[PDB]
Amino acid sequence: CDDIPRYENELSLRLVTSTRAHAKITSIDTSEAKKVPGFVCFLTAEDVPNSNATGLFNDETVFAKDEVTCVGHIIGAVVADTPEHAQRAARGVKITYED
Amino acid sequence: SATLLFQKDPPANVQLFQEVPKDQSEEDMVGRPLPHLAANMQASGEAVYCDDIPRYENELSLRLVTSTRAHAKITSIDTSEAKKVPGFVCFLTAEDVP
Amino acid sequence: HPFLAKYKVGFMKTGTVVALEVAHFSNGGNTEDLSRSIMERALFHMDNAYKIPNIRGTGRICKTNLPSNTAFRGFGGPQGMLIAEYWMSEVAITCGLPAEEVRRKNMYKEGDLTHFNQKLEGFTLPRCWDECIASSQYLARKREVEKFNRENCWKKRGLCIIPTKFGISFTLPFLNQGGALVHVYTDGSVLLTHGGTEMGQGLHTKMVQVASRALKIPTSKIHISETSTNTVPNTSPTAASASADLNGQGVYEACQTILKRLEPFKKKKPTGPWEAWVMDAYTSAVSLSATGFYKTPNLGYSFETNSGNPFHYFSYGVACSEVEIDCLTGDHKNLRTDIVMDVGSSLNPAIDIGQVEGAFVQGLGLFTMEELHYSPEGSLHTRGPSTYKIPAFGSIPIEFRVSLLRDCPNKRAIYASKAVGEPPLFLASSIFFAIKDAIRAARAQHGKQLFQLDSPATPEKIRNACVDQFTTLCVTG
Amino acid sequence: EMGQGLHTKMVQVASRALKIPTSKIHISETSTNTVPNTSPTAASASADLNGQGVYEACQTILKRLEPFKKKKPTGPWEAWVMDAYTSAVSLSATGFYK
Amino acid sequence: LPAIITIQDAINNNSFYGSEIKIEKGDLKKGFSEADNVVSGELYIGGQE
Amino acid sequence: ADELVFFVNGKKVVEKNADPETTLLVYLRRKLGLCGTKLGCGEGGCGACTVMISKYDRLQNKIVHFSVNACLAPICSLHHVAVTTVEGIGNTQKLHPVQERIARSHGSQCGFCTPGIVMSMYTLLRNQPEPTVEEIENAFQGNLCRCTGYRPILQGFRTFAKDGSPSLFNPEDFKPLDPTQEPIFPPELLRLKDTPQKKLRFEGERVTWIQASTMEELLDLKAQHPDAKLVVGNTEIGIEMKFKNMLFPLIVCPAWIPELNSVVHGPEGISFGASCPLSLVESVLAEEIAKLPEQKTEVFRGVMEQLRWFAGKQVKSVASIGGNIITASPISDLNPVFMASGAKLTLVSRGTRRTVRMDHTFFPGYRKTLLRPEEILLSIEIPYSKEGEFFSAFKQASRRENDIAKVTSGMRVLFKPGTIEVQELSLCFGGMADRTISALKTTPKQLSKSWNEELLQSVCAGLAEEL
Amino acid sequence: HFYLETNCTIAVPKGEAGEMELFVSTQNTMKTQSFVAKMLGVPDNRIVVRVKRMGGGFGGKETRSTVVSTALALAAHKTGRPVRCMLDRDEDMLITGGR
Ligand SMILES: Cc1cc2nc3c(=O)[nH]c(=O)nc-3n(C[C@H](O)[C@H](O)[C@H](O)COP(=O)(O)OP(=O)(O)OC[C@H]3O[C@@H](n4cnc5c(N)ncnc54)[C@H](O)[C@@H]3O)c2cc1C
Ligand code: FES
């Protein structure tokens, strides 16, 4: 898959994941992410067009909504021009939790 | 009428066709004047034609070289000027055909 | 392909044609490509609409140092037919009889054999003719034209009504085949593909309409994304007007296969909706994917025995066009065109009217504007719209009337439809022969009867044929 | 294909089913728009399931080629195929197994 | 090299794609000899882009 | 100095390395990825590349809108304008009335011409939200469609006009047009209108482009570098570069210079700046034709008649009057009219200004004028007709070669007052030689003669010999 | 699983009729297609999932590949541009679970 040449207009995505096993998502601050060169956007549950309910038994979120339920639970995705810029922008997404 | 300047009269167009049977389902479109499925996208410029497909970053461009003569032998091909053009990659001829 | 024809026609004083010999030559250019098949189709239509008991046509394809000429909507038909209408125009003039009558009395009747011995069944041409005569008010409009002409020395009008017969199917029989592939996913949505390509003719639209009837679900649940050799292989080109015919049947068959497989689940829940049938088929491990295929039966002509049917059926139509020429410039207006076209029970009258209009306007281009020029050494000089004039918005008939013939189902194509793409093109010859009628009137104003009008009848050709004190002075003091 | 040699096996199967060399058979990829509603490649079951699928698709093709086989029992595979094509016989088929 | 450009060039150089194609029915000889009038002529039709 | 700044569908574009050879069409498609705008011919004939330009006219103190052919528009000429493409007016989620109506009326078959026609219609509605049927037809003189036969496009669009078996479509279901809901003129461009414009320089792989801000800059550059090729609308140079593989290493665009864009009424006629687009000439002379007595507007009406069947709206919005004159094509439709009317040209360099009444001498050879390499054409005065002075213009609408052998003519007669006796007679022709000519052997013979059958036959005999 | 190729999706939006093509390292084209369709709110017939080959699956790409595929699909839909994501080993080991 990754050996496939990139289109000249292609963007890179980097997942942003919960650092808590179980907690409410209190706030999300993308302010530092926006300064990273080539940053395009941060995707969260709000950007889902139809349904945030996925998984084989429909009990999973695409993107976390209100609470995170494992260390690694996907909260959102940074989109940027390059993967290096996506990694950097992802680090500038600060999440505040209530356990 | 020899001195009159060109004058277009009002256009007046008629299109006659046959209604489908009254009992034909509203879902059965055969025989009905359904718009071309792509018409909206064509009017919006969203419909994709070949050259609208995005380039791969490694994509190259080709240009054909054609005969300026109706019937002639090819005696020489000189590419020396082609090669000076920035971004030049190669000139394909019969001998490149696998 | 450019065409040169040499003709000799023998007729009675009534205008009844009794003998015809035509030698055709086409300029094929520097590869064969489709040139021979194109010459075949010209020869299959050298009769246009007319029964001729004694008849000889030959064709020869010239090999030349020019870009190879190819298929163009009509595929030798309009060339064959223009020659036919050209000597027919001279038949009428020679007899001193109304052209509409001379054409009418020479027209095939139902059950007649063509010059290639195919029988004409479901011969709708007479009704197309009668309807077009009435709806165009041809006889009353002929009088107003004659009146205009007496009242005007330097502008003239012309009026001509022209019929056509066009054979439907590739002349190479095995090309009359098509394939489809259909998937129903577990959400009930359908992905369909077939060998036809979309180039603006609304083929995908038609195939979705077909699939939606066949499956008895809305068009909104069916999608066509594209045409691909890795979904349907060994496809014929999208051509010879036949693609909705061939692929419609393919699509129809693939849909019948799916229906047959859903039948048990339909029986068990005859009310419960499409989506439940499909999910029940899936969770019962029934295949929700099918191929479909069609071949046009019973085709194959021999030039050797002059037997076998090259066509599955014929398209028929008629156009009456009126023009006003400017005798001093060679310019002209297309005032009005009335078309009655048999497209069977149209799959899609919006699209079919679209095709009649587009085809007609391309023909208008072929026959009146649209000249390619080449240097003496064979270099094309006309290479863009600055020098090659295709019809513009302002070129079309000011009053433009099109009717699709009512109550003429065609049993042997998909849902009783007929092909439409190419047959209307030749009906623009009606503008050409109306121009020819206008030129004659100008010539009689100042003051030889079978004058030459080559195609295309451009401002140059119209002006030069309008012989007067100016043309005489310029050609010789 | 995830390294378990499933495509190799299915080419093996089709070669036997059709009685032609594996050299004449190619598998390029897996796609939802060529075969729909597919189970995951899992439960060690993939060669059993798709093997039968391929085998049935091949048998359909053989069935269509039979007449041309019987008319030319020696002259090669390429001749049967061209004969079928120019006689307007479908050379595409689905296969399925449960 | 010598070029063959027009239809007339090709005719008088015998430069063709294969042989004459022909359809004929009835009796031309009888047909013409029984007609009231005969009219011959020629027609050129230009191509199209 | 150096940055190219313009707007596309309301979004600011900053291009730091503008190449003068880059067209707007290439920029939209390959740089911005907006592929709604198409390549059909690259020649200005087909309109598939039609987009709308919006700008602040400094000289009229208003926001103007016009269509152009993106295939011929250098991006380097577009500093501080706003471009609108088909993507700018709506999409399938929210179609503009123009889009919806062409689609639902079966006005789109292959769909390749559809964006261009949509933009020609859209631009008409921005200038005239209630056009006549005639204005609607005229909007498409530069738009070709190979599929539809045009009827459904005009019929669908006929619904926008003030003067407007089942049906193929239902006009009653069409969403109505609210002109207030079109996109704002970029406020940034309204702020920048107040800054004085200065000279710009763009440097490409092969070509340098200088966008001159004043007459002084232009004439200085031409005095020190007479080789500097003036580019205004680029409707001729664009073709020379793309199709005749001509290269002008140094280009100067004077389109901003006020003196080249001015319209001045004088006692003898109306003076137009050399860089005035033909659409401005058309709109000025049309107002004059409607206001002034017929006896004064014979030459104006000859100009308007030549401009009637002269390319479309896209070409006339940027094709300059001066550009037509200096191109000096043998088949110019305007040069025969200017020659026959004796229009007064003002030619300037750094430190010279002269006047010539156009005559046979102005064009001494194929595509040459009598301008010196350092002169530019400042202006042309199109004269009022006098009492007893008559003008007709004519042209062959049927073209066979690039730039020769299409007849086009200006014809003028002046009568001794109260009489039908010829005081002056001028018959000028394009398409009968490698330059615009005057029939100067035939016309002198006719001076004094009465306007009768004996004059007709003498002129005809003369023209048949001389031409 | 420690498939030597980690999870990877490229989503290519076609900009007609919600049509999207995905190139995915997955054992499960069907569910990948379904979960993308459902999230976007388009029918299955708009979504094509293509798999040439995987650098290993072992079951770990039978379902859990979709958590990458869906996110990427979304980004492609929002931007109208192709979007790519290949996980780093640490991300894959954390997000995608195990035996
Ligand atoms: C599609 C199409 C159809 C057309 N149809 C017609 C037609 O029917 N009849 C007709 O007559 N013409 C026609 N033209 C030509 C058109 O009128 C001219 O191309 C146009 O007027 C040139 O103006 P421009 O500003 O685009 O000139 P540019 O291409 O920018 O320049 C043209 C020439 O004039 C020079 N120049 C420009 N301004 C000055 C000045 N002030 N002083 C000195 N030199 C100057 C330039 O250096 C260049 O050599 C057509 C063009 C197109 C593209
Ligand atoms: S591409 Fe044809 S006018 Fe621009």
Ligand code: FES
């Ligand atoms: S719809 Fe095909 S060119 Fe207009």
